[PDB]
């Protein structure tokens, strides 16, 4: 119910130097995303394995990448463990993350960005693709809720009455930049799994919509 919360200063800090950066290799976002997608159904298998009831919520584990052309947005889905309420509030944006500080001075150092995932920080190299972005999620423990940042110091954490039913696991929408809208097309988000993604455990979905002619 429009519950805002502040970003800690340094995510704050993270959010705008990534927004703004020109780094020649913004593809490596995606790599970050479906790894985060396989960590989170790393955990429901791992879960699963003691207690297969928890897979009932969603039987099959899937990664999904969902272009919305006309939206220009680019969904990314994955069937893991999911987040509740307060796992939303907590693992993205309210808790000094380690490594944060470490990566920004890494990066004044000469860093490359794509280490980014190595500091535990590879969330938000979604911003170097996307203004504002949506995290849906659904935790066997919770209600469904969305998360919302547009980028700035705040975000926003809503039960969720407006989106498709998860069942469980994770759906980034991520509202892309107008110079970024390469990355709603198949054969660019081809290419960018295959290249960096080469080494998944789950299936990667693609959904491709066509018209039907002749
Ligand atoms: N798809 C997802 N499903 C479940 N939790 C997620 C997902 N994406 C991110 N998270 C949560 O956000 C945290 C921050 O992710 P990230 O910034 O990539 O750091 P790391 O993956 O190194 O923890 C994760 O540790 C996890 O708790
Ligand atoms: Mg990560
Ligand atoms: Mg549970």
New binding site residues.
């Given amino acids: 119910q429009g519950e805002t919360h502040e970003f800690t200063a340094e995510i704050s800090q993270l959010m705008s130097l990534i927004i703004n950066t020109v780094y020649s290799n913004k593809e490596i976002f995606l790599r ?2 479906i ?3 396989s ?2 159904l790393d955990k429901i298998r791992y879960q699963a394995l003691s207690d297969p009831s928890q897979l009932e919520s969603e039987p099959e584990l899937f990664i999904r990448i969902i272009p919305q052309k006309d939206q220009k947005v680019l969904e990314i889905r ?1 069937s ?4 509740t309420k307060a ?1 939303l509030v907590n ?2 944006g309210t808790i000094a ?1 380690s490594g944060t500080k470490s990566f920004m001075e890494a990066l004044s150092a000469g860093a490359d960005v794509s280490m980014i ?1 190595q500091f ?5 190299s979604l911003f170097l693709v996307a203004d504002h972005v949506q ?1 849906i ?1 659904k935790h066997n423990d919770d209600e469904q809720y969305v998360w919302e940042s547009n980028a700035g110091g705040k975000f926003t954490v809503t039960l969720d009455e407006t989106n498709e039913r998860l069942g469980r ?2 759906m ?1 929408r991520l509202f892309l930049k107008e110079d970024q809208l390469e990355y709603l097309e198949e054969k660019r988000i081809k290419e960018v799994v295959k290249k960096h993604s080469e080494f998944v455990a789950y299936p990667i979905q693609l959904v491709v919509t066509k018209e039907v002619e002749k």
Avoid: R
């Fill in positions: 970050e995303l790894s985060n997608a960590d989170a994955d893991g463990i999911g987040m796992d693992n993205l993350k995932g535990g920080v590879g969330f938000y995290v999620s696991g994770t980034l």
